Short mmCIF file of C-alpha atoms (C1' of nucleotides) and ligand atoms in Angstrom, two decimals:
data_model
loop_
_atom_site.label_atom_id
_atom_site.label_comp_id
_atom_site.label_asym_id
_atom_site.label_seq_id
_atom_site.Cartn_x
_atom_site.Cartn_y
_atom_site.Cartn_z
CA UNK A 1 0.00 0.00 0.00
CA UNK A 2 2.79 2.41 0.89
CA UNK A 3 4.48 1.83 -2.47
CA UNK A 4 1.17 2.51 -4.21
CA UNK A 5 0.91 5.80 -2.31
CA UNK A 6 4.53 6.66 -3.15
CA UNK A 7 3.64 6.39 -6.83
CA UNK A 8 1.07 9.16 -6.37
CA UNK A 9 3.71 11.00 -4.35
CA UNK A 10 6.08 10.88 -7.32
CA UNK A 11 3.29 12.15 -9.57
CA UNK A 12 2.77 15.09 -7.23
CA UNK A 13 6.53 15.60 -7.20
CA UNK A 14 6.59 15.92 -10.97
CA UNK A 15 3.68 18.38 -10.80
CA UNK A 16 5.48 20.49 -8.21
CA UNK A 17 8.66 20.41 -10.30
CA UNK A 18 6.71 21.68 -13.30
CA UNK A 19 5.25 24.57 -11.33
CA UNK A 20 8.55 25.43 -9.63
CA UNK A 21 10.37 25.55 -12.96
CA UNK A 22 7.66 27.71 -14.49
CA UNK A 23 7.88 30.18 -11.61
CA UNK A 24 11.70 30.15 -11.64
CA UNK A 25 11.82 30.92 -15.36
CA UNK A 26 9.27 33.70 -14.91
CA UNK A 27 11.41 35.24 -12.17
CA UNK A 28 14.56 34.95 -14.27
CA UNK A 29 12.95 36.74 -17.20
CA UNK A 30 11.49 39.37 -14.88
CA UNK A 31 14.88 40.04 -13.30
CA UNK A 32 16.43 40.39 -16.74
CA UNK A 33 13.73 42.90 -17.66
CA UNK A 34 14.31 44.86 -14.46
CA UNK A 35 18.03 45.00 -15.20
CA UNK A 36 17.17 46.24 -18.67
CA UNK A 37 14.89 49.03 -17.40
CA UNK A 38 17.47 50.70 -15.19
CA UNK A 39 16.75 53.68 -17.48
CA UNK A 40 14.14 54.83 -14.90
CA UNK A 41 11.19 54.06 -17.16
CA UNK A 42 9.94 51.49 -14.66
CA UNK A 43 9.50 53.26 -11.33
CA UNK A 44 6.06 54.64 -12.12
CA UNK A 45 5.67 54.75 -15.90
CA UNK A 46 5.88 50.99 -16.33
CA UNK A 47 4.53 50.16 -12.88
CA UNK A 48 1.06 51.68 -13.03
CA UNK A 49 -0.25 49.85 -9.99
CA UNK A 50 -3.74 51.01 -10.97
CA UNK B 1 -14.41 29.35 -27.19
CA UNK B 2 -11.29 28.49 -25.20
CA UNK B 3 -8.77 30.96 -26.68
CA UNK B 4 -9.36 34.69 -26.48
CA UNK B 5 -9.77 36.13 -29.97
CA UNK B 6 -7.78 39.35 -30.43
CA UNK B 7 -8.87 41.44 -33.38
CA UNK B 8 -5.82 43.63 -33.91
CA UNK B 9 -3.58 40.55 -33.74
CA UNK B 10 -5.56 38.10 -35.84
CA UNK B 11 -6.07 40.84 -38.42
CA UNK B 12 -2.33 41.37 -38.64
CA UNK B 13 -1.86 37.62 -38.90
CA UNK B 14 -4.33 37.51 -41.77
CA UNK B 15 -2.65 40.38 -43.58
CA UNK B 16 0.74 38.74 -43.21
CA UNK B 17 -0.68 35.43 -44.43
CA UNK B 18 -2.15 37.08 -47.51
CA UNK B 19 1.08 38.93 -48.26
CA UNK B 20 3.09 35.76 -47.81
CA UNK B 21 0.77 33.83 -50.11
CA UNK B 22 0.91 36.50 -52.80
CA UNK B 23 4.67 36.92 -52.67
CA UNK B 24 4.79 33.14 -52.93
CA UNK B 25 3.06 33.73 -56.27
CA UNK B 26 -0.38 32.39 -55.42
CA UNK B 27 -3.58 34.10 -56.66
CA UNK B 28 -5.04 35.33 -53.39
CA UNK B 29 -7.45 37.48 -55.39
CA UNK B 30 -10.69 36.10 -56.77
CA UNK B 31 -10.11 38.10 -59.97
CA UNK B 32 -9.01 36.44 -63.20
CA UNK B 33 -8.17 39.76 -64.84
CA UNK B 34 -4.58 40.79 -64.22
CA UNK B 35 -5.36 44.48 -63.71
CA UNK B 36 -8.06 44.10 -61.06
CA UNK B 37 -5.93 41.55 -59.22
CA UNK B 38 -2.97 43.93 -59.29
CA UNK B 39 -5.10 46.81 -57.99
CA UNK B 40 -6.51 44.69 -55.18
CA UNK B 41 -3.02 43.50 -54.25
CA UNK B 42 -1.69 47.06 -54.27
CA UNK B 43 -4.49 48.20 -51.98
CA UNK B 44 -3.81 45.25 -49.70
CA UNK B 45 -0.16 46.30 -49.56
CA UNK B 46 -1.25 49.80 -48.59
CA UNK B 47 -3.37 48.16 -45.89
CA UNK B 48 -0.21 47.17 -44.05
CA UNK B 49 -0.75 49.62 -41.19
CA UNK B 50 -4.55 49.18 -41.20
CA UNK B 51 -5.24 45.54 -40.32
CA UNK B 52 -8.88 46.42 -39.62
CA UNK B 53 -9.58 47.10 -43.29
CA UNK B 54 -7.95 43.76 -44.13
CA UNK B 55 -11.20 42.03 -43.23
CA UNK B 56 -12.99 44.21 -45.75
CA UNK B 57 -10.31 43.57 -48.35
CA UNK B 58 -10.90 39.89 -47.69
CA UNK B 59 -14.64 40.21 -48.19
CA UNK B 60 -14.01 42.16 -51.41
CA UNK B 61 -11.14 40.42 -53.21
CA UNK B 62 -10.14 37.24 -51.36
CA UNK B 63 -10.04 34.09 -53.50
CA UNK B 64 -12.91 31.70 -52.59
CA UNK B 65 -10.40 28.83 -52.38
CA UNK B 66 -8.65 30.14 -49.29
CA UNK B 67 -11.43 30.21 -46.68
CA UNK B 68 -10.60 26.80 -45.24
CA UNK B 69 -6.83 27.27 -45.21
CA UNK B 70 -7.27 30.74 -43.74
CA UNK B 71 -9.52 29.65 -40.89
CA UNK B 72 -7.22 26.70 -40.29
CA UNK B 73 -3.96 28.58 -40.28
CA UNK B 74 -5.22 31.40 -38.07
CA UNK B 75 -6.90 28.96 -35.69
CA UNK B 76 -3.66 27.00 -35.35
CA UNK B 77 -1.63 30.18 -34.98
CA UNK B 78 -3.93 31.31 -32.16
CA UNK B 79 -3.61 27.96 -30.41
CA UNK B 80 0.17 28.00 -30.73
CA UNK B 81 0.45 31.59 -29.56
CA UNK B 82 -1.54 30.88 -26.43
CA UNK B 83 0.27 27.60 -25.72
CA UNK B 84 3.79 29.00 -26.12
CA UNK B 85 3.43 31.01 -22.89
CA UNK B 86 4.20 28.02 -20.62
CA UNK B 87 6.60 25.16 -21.23
CA UNK B 88 4.22 22.54 -19.90
CA UNK B 89 1.80 23.55 -22.65
CA UNK B 90 4.42 23.77 -25.38
CA UNK B 91 5.02 21.19 -28.10
CA UNK B 92 8.29 19.61 -29.23
CA UNK B 93 8.88 18.58 -32.83
CA UNK B 94 10.83 15.39 -33.47
CA UNK B 95 11.57 13.26 -36.52
CA UNK B 96 11.24 9.46 -36.65
CA UNK B 97 12.60 6.82 -39.00
CA UNK B 98 10.05 4.97 -41.11
CA UNK B 99 10.33 1.56 -39.37
CA UNK B 100 10.13 3.14 -35.94
CA UNK B 101 7.26 5.41 -36.90
CA UNK B 102 5.47 2.51 -38.57
CA UNK B 103 5.66 0.32 -35.48
CA UNK B 104 4.71 3.18 -33.18
CA UNK B 105 1.75 4.24 -35.27
CA UNK B 106 0.54 0.66 -35.60
CA UNK B 107 0.71 0.30 -31.84
CA UNK B 108 -1.19 3.57 -31.34
CA UNK B 109 -4.07 2.72 -33.69
CA UNK B 110 -4.16 -0.66 -32.00
CA UNK B 111 -4.54 1.00 -28.61
CA UNK B 112 -6.72 3.71 -30.13
CA UNK B 113 -4.81 6.60 -28.55
CA UNK B 114 -2.72 9.51 -29.72
CA UNK B 115 1.02 9.21 -30.21
CA UNK B 116 1.75 11.14 -27.03
CA UNK B 117 -0.62 8.89 -25.07
CA UNK B 118 1.02 5.75 -26.44
CA UNK B 119 4.46 7.12 -25.54
CA UNK B 120 3.12 7.95 -22.08
CA UNK B 121 1.95 4.37 -21.61
CA UNK B 122 5.25 2.94 -22.86
CA UNK B 123 7.52 5.19 -20.80
CA UNK B 124 5.26 4.61 -17.81
CA UNK B 125 5.62 0.85 -18.15
CA UNK B 126 9.40 1.24 -18.33
CA UNK B 127 9.38 3.53 -15.29
CA UNK B 128 7.09 1.09 -13.46
CA UNK B 129 9.65 -1.62 -14.14
CA UNK B 130 12.34 0.68 -12.75
CA UNK B 131 10.23 1.45 -9.67
CA UNK B 132 9.48 -2.19 -8.93
CA UNK B 133 13.19 -2.87 -9.28
CA UNK B 134 13.67 -0.06 -6.75
CA UNK B 135 10.66 -0.14 -4.39
CA UNK C 1 5.24 77.67 -36.06
CA UNK C 2 1.91 77.14 -34.32
CA UNK C 3 1.01 74.29 -36.65
CA UNK C 4 4.37 72.60 -36.18
CA UNK C 5 4.33 72.86 -32.40
CA UNK C 6 0.74 71.63 -32.18
CA UNK C 7 1.55 68.61 -34.33
CA UNK C 8 4.66 67.87 -32.29
CA UNK C 9 2.82 68.09 -28.97
CA UNK C 10 -0.02 65.90 -30.19
CA UNK C 11 2.38 63.30 -31.57
CA UNK C 12 4.40 63.20 -28.36
CA UNK C 13 1.28 62.87 -26.23
CA UNK C 14 -0.21 60.09 -28.33
CA UNK C 15 3.00 58.12 -28.67
CA UNK C 16 3.81 58.23 -24.97
CA UNK C 17 0.32 57.36 -23.79
CA UNK C 18 -0.06 54.49 -26.24
CA UNK C 19 3.37 53.00 -25.56
CA UNK C 20 2.72 53.06 -21.82
CA UNK C 21 -0.72 51.51 -22.26
CA UNK C 22 0.68 48.81 -24.53
CA UNK C 23 3.59 47.80 -22.31
CA UNK C 24 2.54 48.31 -18.69
CA UNK C 25 -0.56 46.14 -19.12
CA UNK C 26 1.37 43.06 -20.20
CA UNK C 27 3.93 43.81 -17.50
CA UNK C 28 1.21 43.83 -14.83
CA UNK C 29 -0.39 40.74 -16.31
CA UNK C 30 2.87 38.79 -16.04
CA UNK C 31 3.49 40.10 -12.53
CA UNK C 32 0.02 38.97 -11.48
CA UNK C 33 0.31 35.47 -12.92
CA UNK C 34 3.80 35.04 -11.46
CA UNK C 35 2.36 35.93 -8.05
CA UNK C 36 -0.50 33.48 -8.57
CA UNK C 37 1.81 30.67 -9.71
CA UNK C 38 4.04 31.21 -6.69
CA UNK C 39 1.01 31.03 -4.42
CA UNK C 40 -0.08 27.76 -6.03
CA UNK C 41 3.42 26.27 -5.93
CA UNK C 42 3.74 26.87 -2.20
CA UNK C 43 0.61 24.82 -1.51
CA UNK C 44 1.90 22.07 -3.78
CA UNK C 45 5.24 22.14 -1.96
CA UNK C 46 3.70 21.90 1.49
CA UNK C 47 1.46 19.01 0.52
CA UNK C 48 4.41 17.24 -1.07
CA UNK C 49 6.59 17.61 2.01
CA UNK C 50 3.89 16.27 4.29
CA UNK D 1 31.11 24.09 -11.20
CA UNK D 2 28.78 24.15 -8.21
CA UNK D 3 30.53 27.10 -6.54
CA UNK D 4 29.96 29.26 -9.63
CA UNK D 5 26.58 27.84 -10.62
CA UNK D 6 25.47 29.08 -7.21
CA UNK D 7 26.61 32.59 -8.16
CA UNK D 8 24.96 32.24 -11.57
CA UNK D 9 21.69 31.31 -9.89
CA UNK D 10 21.89 34.04 -7.28
CA UNK D 11 22.80 36.83 -9.70
CA UNK D 12 20.19 35.92 -12.31
CA UNK D 13 17.45 35.25 -9.73
CA UNK D 14 18.11 38.47 -7.81
CA UNK D 15 19.55 40.45 -10.71
CA UNK D 16 22.56 41.57 -8.70
CA UNK D 17 26.06 41.79 -10.13
CA UNK D 18 28.38 38.81 -10.11
CA UNK D 19 30.90 41.02 -8.34
CA UNK D 20 28.33 41.82 -5.65
CA UNK D 21 27.65 38.17 -4.84
CA UNK D 22 30.54 37.09 -2.62
CA UNK D 23 30.65 34.12 -0.27
CA UNK D 24 29.57 36.15 2.77
CA UNK D 25 27.02 38.31 0.93
CA UNK D 26 23.74 37.93 2.81
CA UNK D 27 20.70 37.88 0.56
CA UNK D 28 18.40 40.29 2.38
CA UNK D 29 20.85 43.04 3.36
CA UNK D 30 23.58 42.75 0.73
CA UNK D 31 21.61 41.43 -2.24
CA UNK D 32 18.35 43.07 -1.12
CA UNK D 33 16.25 39.98 -1.83
CA UNK D 34 13.03 40.09 0.18
CA UNK D 35 10.67 37.30 1.25
CA UNK D 36 9.42 36.29 -2.20
CA UNK D 37 12.77 37.12 -3.81
CA UNK D 38 14.53 34.79 -1.37
CA UNK D 39 11.83 32.16 -1.91
CA UNK D 40 12.47 32.34 -5.65
CA UNK D 41 16.21 32.15 -5.03
CA UNK D 42 15.87 28.96 -2.99
CA UNK D 43 13.45 27.49 -5.53
CA UNK D 44 15.94 28.23 -8.31
CA UNK D 45 18.78 26.69 -6.30
CA UNK D 46 16.61 23.59 -5.89
CA UNK D 47 15.88 23.54 -9.61
CA UNK D 48 19.52 24.01 -10.62
CA UNK D 49 20.71 20.88 -8.84
CA UNK D 50 17.40 19.00 -9.13
CA UNK D 51 17.34 18.38 -5.39
CA UNK D 52 15.09 19.18 -2.45
CA UNK D 53 15.68 20.87 0.89
CA UNK D 54 13.64 20.88 4.11
CA UNK D 55 11.65 24.01 4.80
CA UNK D 56 13.43 24.85 8.06
CA UNK D 57 16.89 23.88 6.83
CA UNK D 58 16.29 25.92 3.69
CA UNK D 59 15.13 29.02 5.55
CA UNK D 60 18.17 28.64 7.78
CA UNK D 61 20.20 29.40 4.66
CA UNK D 62 20.51 33.18 4.49
CA UNK D 63 23.88 33.80 2.82
CA UNK D 64 25.94 32.74 -0.18
CA UNK D 65 28.33 30.85 2.08
CA UNK D 66 25.47 28.99 3.77
CA UNK D 67 23.92 28.32 0.36
CA UNK D 68 27.07 26.64 -0.95
CA UNK D 69 27.60 24.90 2.39
CA UNK D 70 24.24 23.17 2.06
CA UNK D 71 24.70 22.56 -1.67
CA UNK D 72 28.16 21.00 -1.35
CA UNK E 1 30.97 11.38 -49.61
CA UNK E 2 27.73 9.41 -49.60
CA UNK E 3 25.40 11.41 -51.89
CA UNK E 4 26.56 12.48 -55.33
CA UNK E 5 26.20 16.23 -55.85
CA UNK E 6 24.47 17.54 -58.99
CA UNK E 7 25.26 21.06 -60.14
CA UNK E 8 22.10 22.00 -62.01
CA UNK E 9 20.14 20.94 -58.93
CA UNK E 10 22.22 22.23 -56.03
CA UNK E 11 22.82 25.51 -57.85
CA UNK E 12 19.10 26.00 -58.31
CA UNK E 13 18.71 25.21 -54.64
CA UNK E 14 21.28 27.86 -53.76
CA UNK E 15 19.67 30.46 -56.01
CA UNK E 16 16.26 29.79 -54.49
CA UNK E 17 17.68 29.89 -50.95
CA UNK E 18 19.41 33.20 -51.55
CA UNK E 19 16.34 34.70 -53.19
CA UNK E 20 14.20 33.57 -50.27
CA UNK E 21 16.66 35.06 -47.79
CA UNK E 22 16.74 38.35 -49.69
CA UNK E 23 12.95 38.47 -49.77
CA UNK E 24 13.13 37.88 -46.04
CA UNK E 25 15.35 40.96 -45.66
CA UNK E 26 18.62 39.15 -45.04
CA UNK E 27 21.63 41.05 -46.42
CA UNK E 28 22.82 38.67 -49.10
CA UNK E 29 25.81 40.76 -50.10
CA UNK E 30 28.88 42.06 -48.28
CA UNK E 31 28.30 45.64 -49.49
CA UNK E 32 27.22 48.09 -46.80
CA UNK E 33 26.34 50.69 -49.43
CA UNK E 34 22.77 50.06 -50.50
CA UNK E 35 23.45 50.78 -54.18
CA UNK E 36 26.04 48.05 -54.67
CA UNK E 37 23.94 45.56 -52.72
CA UNK E 38 20.89 46.36 -54.84
CA UNK E 39 22.90 46.08 -58.05
CA UNK E 40 24.32 42.71 -57.03
CA UNK E 41 20.89 41.47 -55.99
CA UNK E 42 19.44 42.56 -59.33
CA UNK E 43 22.26 40.75 -61.11
CA UNK E 44 21.37 37.68 -59.07
CA UNK E 45 17.67 38.06 -59.91
CA UNK E 46 18.42 38.23 -63.62
CA UNK E 47 21.00 35.49 -63.08
CA UNK E 48 18.24 32.90 -62.76
CA UNK E 49 18.64 29.73 -64.82
CA UNK E 50 22.43 29.67 -64.43
CA UNK E 51 24.45 27.38 -62.15
CA UNK E 52 27.89 28.15 -63.51
CA UNK E 53 27.39 31.88 -63.00
CA UNK E 54 25.40 31.82 -59.77
CA UNK E 55 28.40 30.02 -58.31
CA UNK E 56 30.65 32.85 -59.50
CA UNK E 57 28.16 35.42 -58.24
CA UNK E 58 28.35 33.77 -54.84
CA UNK E 59 32.14 33.76 -54.95
CA UNK E 60 32.24 37.46 -55.78
CA UNK E 61 29.33 39.14 -53.94
CA UNK E 62 28.26 36.65 -51.24
CA UNK E 63 27.99 37.76 -47.61
CA UNK E 64 30.82 36.07 -45.66
CA UNK E 65 28.71 35.08 -42.63
CA UNK E 66 26.04 33.12 -44.50
CA UNK E 67 28.45 30.63 -46.08
CA UNK E 68 28.13 28.09 -43.28
CA UNK E 69 24.35 28.33 -43.05
CA UNK E 70 24.02 27.95 -46.79
CA UNK E 71 26.42 25.02 -46.74
CA UNK E 72 24.52 23.17 -44.03
CA UNK E 73 21.17 23.97 -45.62
CA UNK E 74 22.44 22.46 -48.87
CA UNK E 75 23.80 19.44 -47.01
CA UNK E 76 20.39 18.85 -45.46
CA UNK E 77 18.64 19.44 -48.77
CA UNK E 78 20.88 16.90 -50.49
CA UNK E 79 20.40 14.28 -47.79
CA UNK E 80 16.63 14.76 -47.77
CA UNK E 81 16.50 14.68 -51.56
CA UNK E 82 18.31 11.37 -51.72
CA UNK E 83 16.44 9.84 -48.77
CA UNK E 84 12.94 10.82 -49.89
CA UNK E 85 12.98 8.31 -52.75
CA UNK E 86 12.38 5.15 -50.69
CA UNK E 87 9.96 4.58 -47.84
CA UNK E 88 12.45 3.02 -45.47
CA UNK E 89 14.83 5.95 -45.86
CA UNK E 90 12.15 8.58 -45.37
CA UNK E 91 11.65 10.32 -42.04
CA UNK E 92 8.36 10.88 -40.20
CA UNK E 93 7.98 14.13 -38.25
CA UNK E 94 5.75 14.34 -35.17
CA UNK E 95 5.05 16.75 -32.32
CA UNK E 96 5.33 15.63 -28.68
CA UNK E 97 3.86 17.30 -25.61
CA UNK E 98 6.53 18.87 -23.43
CA UNK E 99 6.32 16.49 -20.42
CA UNK E 100 6.38 13.39 -22.61
CA UNK E 101 9.27 14.78 -24.61
CA UNK E 102 11.12 15.69 -21.44
CA UNK E 103 10.85 12.18 -20.02
CA UNK E 104 11.71 10.50 -23.32
CA UNK E 105 14.75 12.70 -23.80
CA UNK E 106 15.73 12.10 -20.19
CA UNK E 107 15.83 8.41 -21.00
CA UNK E 108 17.75 9.00 -24.26
CA UNK E 109 20.55 11.07 -22.68
CA UNK E 110 20.69 8.67 -19.76
CA UNK E 111 21.18 5.69 -22.04
CA UNK E 112 23.25 7.52 -24.65
CA UNK E 113 20.85 6.48 -27.41
CA UNK E 114 19.05 8.61 -29.96
CA UNK E 115 15.32 9.19 -29.92
CA UNK E 116 14.86 6.51 -32.55
CA UNK E 117 17.14 4.07 -30.74
CA UNK E 118 15.57 4.77 -27.36
CA UNK E 119 12.02 4.36 -28.62
CA UNK E 120 12.97 1.20 -30.53
CA UNK E 121 14.48 -0.30 -27.41
CA UNK E 122 11.47 0.66 -25.29
CA UNK E 123 8.98 -0.79 -27.80
CA UNK E 124 11.07 -3.94 -28.05
CA UNK E 125 10.96 -4.29 -24.27
CA UNK E 126 7.19 -3.75 -24.32
CA UNK E 127 6.85 -6.47 -26.96
CA UNK E 128 9.09 -8.74 -24.91
CA UNK E 129 6.88 -8.13 -21.86
CA UNK E 130 3.85 -9.05 -23.97
CA UNK E 131 5.58 -12.28 -24.99
CA UNK E 132 6.57 -13.05 -21.39
CA UNK E 133 2.95 -12.70 -20.34
CA UNK E 134 1.80 -14.46 -23.52
"C1'" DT F 1 41.13 21.22 -40.55
"C1'" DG F 2 37.10 21.36 -44.02
"C1'" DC F 3 33.56 18.80 -45.81
"C1'" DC F 4 29.74 15.70 -45.00
"C1'" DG F 5 26.42 13.03 -43.05
"C1'" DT F 6 23.50 13.05 -39.10
"C1'" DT F 7 20.57 14.33 -35.28
"C1'" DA F 8 17.27 17.41 -32.87
"C1'" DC F 9 15.29 20.51 -32.86
"C1'" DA F 10 12.04 25.42 -34.56
"C1'" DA F 11 8.18 27.70 -37.26
"C1'" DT F 12 4.56 27.50 -40.08
"C1'" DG F 13 1.10 25.45 -42.92
"C1'" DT F 14 -2.77 21.72 -43.66
"C1'" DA F 15 -5.77 18.09 -43.47
"C1'" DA F 16 -8.52 15.62 -40.71
"C1'" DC F 17 -11.07 14.62 -36.66
"C1'" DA F 18 -13.87 16.01 -32.31
"C1'" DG F 19 -16.06 19.20 -29.79
"C1'" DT F 20 -19.24 23.04 -28.93
"C1'" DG F 21 -23.24 25.89 -29.11
"C1'" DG F 22 -27.28 27.92 -31.73
"C1'" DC G 1 -28.31 20.21 -38.55
"C1'" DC G 2 -24.87 23.52 -39.00
"C1'" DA G 3 -21.04 26.39 -38.22
"C1'" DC G 4 -16.94 27.55 -35.84
"C1'" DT G 5 -12.97 25.88 -32.58
"C1'" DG G 6 -9.71 22.93 -30.51
"C1'" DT G 7 -6.61 19.25 -31.44
"C1'" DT G 8 -3.39 15.74 -33.76
"C1'" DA G 9 -0.53 14.22 -37.21
"C1'" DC G 10 1.86 15.01 -40.25
"C1'" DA G 11 4.78 17.98 -43.96
"C1'" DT G 12 8.14 21.52 -45.26
"C1'" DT G 13 12.27 24.13 -44.69
"C1'" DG G 14 16.08 25.90 -41.97
"C1'" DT G 15 19.76 25.60 -38.32
"C1'" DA G 16 23.13 24.35 -34.75
"C1'" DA G 17 25.84 20.84 -32.94
"C1'" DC G 18 28.37 16.23 -33.27
"C1'" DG G 19 31.05 13.25 -35.06
"C1'" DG G 20 33.41 10.77 -39.04
"C1'" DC G 21 36.98 11.18 -42.42
"C1'" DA G 22 40.80 12.83 -45.92
P1 PNS H 1 7.18 37.49 1.93
O1 PNS H 1 7.22 38.55 3.01
O2 PNS H 1 6.02 37.67 0.97
O3 PNS H 1 6.90 36.10 2.70
C1 PNS H 1 6.58 34.93 1.90
C2 PNS H 1 6.43 33.70 2.79
C3 PNS H 1 7.75 33.44 3.53
C4 PNS H 1 5.33 33.95 3.83
C5 PNS H 1 6.06 32.51 1.91
O4 PNS H 1 7.08 32.37 0.93
C6 PNS H 1 5.89 31.18 2.64
O5 PNS H 1 6.87 30.62 3.12
N1 PNS H 1 4.66 30.69 2.72
C7 PNS H 1 4.35 29.39 3.31
C8 PNS H 1 4.66 29.32 4.78
C9 PNS H 1 4.55 27.91 5.32
O6 PNS H 1 5.48 27.39 5.94
N2 PNS H 1 3.39 27.27 5.11
C10 PNS H 1 3.20 25.84 5.35
C11 PNS H 1 2.98 25.07 4.07
S1 PNS H 1 1.62 25.73 3.07
#
DNA sequence: TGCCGTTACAATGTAACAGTGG
DNA sequence: CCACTGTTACATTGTAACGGCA
């Protein structure tokens, strides 16, 4: 029974890996963008919190 | 409807598709006369920065042949554009040798599932073997 | 001179407003979904660890 | 190598300079990474080496030196 | 050398490739000045139906950085042209969902095999399992 | 090395099927 | 029924990277 449950565990592990990678890539791209907008166009002009 | 339809994007896609087809030499126009076809093409070229009028140009001079290919290409382009956002929704293109593809396709129609599903079942059986070896 | 300055002002206004509208919206969209994905991934992570 | 992949991850997940990220550079004060930024940094470190870390032991890591120490 | 190279065919391929690239906006020529580039491109356009002179045109006006890409494109074109004659030598192209592709490639790098070799081995093992049970 | 085959992709286009809603 | 949409399975062409070989 425990091995059967561990199979589902591994499935959930793969799911979590997918999501973690997606988020990590999003953050990497976002950081690159931030480094590219050091020109001061980001502080309010890009970041219209509205 | 699962994919949001964007007018100013699909219109540009359509204009680019028409221009590509014409420059490929195909008769996008429905006109057999050379002069009317040339005039319609010239106007379409002018319509570069006005994708909105491209729909009207379509309704006025588009060749009746192209409706199916148009609605197919733009539908697929929309699907691909929305899927490319995330990796887990992306697609990977691979090439297979004829014997291998023949066996794989035969197996898939036997199991009545898509190629990806058949590969999933196969790799899952191999990984199940690995797991039972591990436990 | 009046005509030229009016045209210039109008062009500047339009270009700036439209560029900001075009860019900031996608920027905010991405920020929002990255936040949401992080939130989801944390729940997945906690369940996995347990 | 691991000791420079760690810098690669930290710099490109926090956007700070490679020169800035030294062994003793703390994330929050030196690199400026806040709660979510540090969370993303640890997630990226996990992803880089395809490993997992306990929650408490991971949060205990709050510096480049500690990061490498747990990685190696 | 496995595939014999034919001039009237490969030269037409090269002319078509260069024309396509030019239509795509690629700078075919090495001339920064627009006039010389346009003149050379017009010469190329009117140079259609000529292998022995399109080769010379390439030698004289071709952009240095596209030589490798053109060479590998022609290699691939030649190989595909010779392989597309027979069924067993043809290649079937498919699209795989990203998770499935990731796992399959994981297996292939792990085992050092190619996608074809890895899938062949896996199917063979599946067949062997069928035979064990049957 | 310089060419040459070979693989693993990418990008786009199509046909065909399956769904969906009016 | 009917139309439009989503999806799969290809094709088609191009490219970069390996690795073999004179
Ligand atoms: P930052 O100030 O936004 O803080 C983020 C966070 C540290 C609160 C967050 O990343 C986090 O760790 N959330 C989950 C906390 C936890 O241990 N929950 C149990 C498993 S759901």
